[PDB]
């Protein structure tokens, strides 16, 4: 198991535009298109992203391609983030995957706000951080997914995804 596979399970895969859990237009593997309520706006972002007149449908290859960019951008956002980098540096391989997922789902900015959990992760206080990560809108809105990520931080294994 790895980051790709992990996120592939959490976001699923869709070839037509759809609305995420917060109601925003997305496509492929959790690729957010726009927060705008406009479908056109979304089709436009899509075409721009793919480089062709898609008409709201892409192929599996295009999907995967966006997916790779999105993963790369996420690591990259972590590495550039003054609050994130240190955390990420301190963690083992499995747990890093967990931080990346969170970043992917919520943006670097979203993640950097978990100051307190971040601190705990850095100190390797596993059970404590898990409890703190849980007191969040994030956990309340997408609890199953959040449970997966948290277990991951807690145990440092992939058990939650097997
Ligand atoms: Cl893009
Ligand atoms: Cl969920």
Curated annotation (Swiss-Prot):
Q: What is the effect of changing residue 11 to A/F/H/M/N?
A: Complete loss of enzymatic activity
The consequence of residue 117 to F is: 10-fold decrease in enzymatic activity
Ordered alphabetically, the record's keywords are:
Antimicrobial, Bacteriolytic enzyme, Cytolysis, Glycosidase, Host cell lysis by virus, Host cytoplasm, Hydrolase, Viral release from host cell
Q: Which InterPro entries match?
A: Endolysin_T4_type (IPR034690), Glyco_hydro_24 (IPR002196), Lysozyme-like_dom_sf (IPR023346), Lysozyme_dom_sf (IPR023347), Phage_lysozyme-like (IPR052619), T4-type_lysozyme (IPR001165)
The yes or no answer to whether the keyword rRNA-binding is present is no
* Positions annotated as active site in the UniProt record: 11 (proton donor/acceptor), 20 (proton donor/acceptor)
Q: What is its EC number?
A: 3.2.1.17
What is the recorded phenotype of mutating residue 30 to A? Almost complete loss of enzymatic activity
**Reactions mediated catalytically:** Hydrolysis of (1->4)-beta-linkages between N-acetylmuramic acid and N-acetyl-D-glucosamine residues in a peptidoglycan and between N-acetyl-D-glucosamine residues in chitodextrins
Q: What function does this protein fulfil?
A: Endolysin with lysozyme activity that degrades host peptidoglycans and participates with the holin and spanin proteins in the sequential events which lead to the programmed host cell lysis releasing the mature viral particles. Once the holin has permeabilized the host cell membrane, the endolysin can reach the periplasm and break down the peptidoglycan layer.
Task: Output this protein's name.
Answer: Endolysin
Q: Which gene encodes it?
A: E
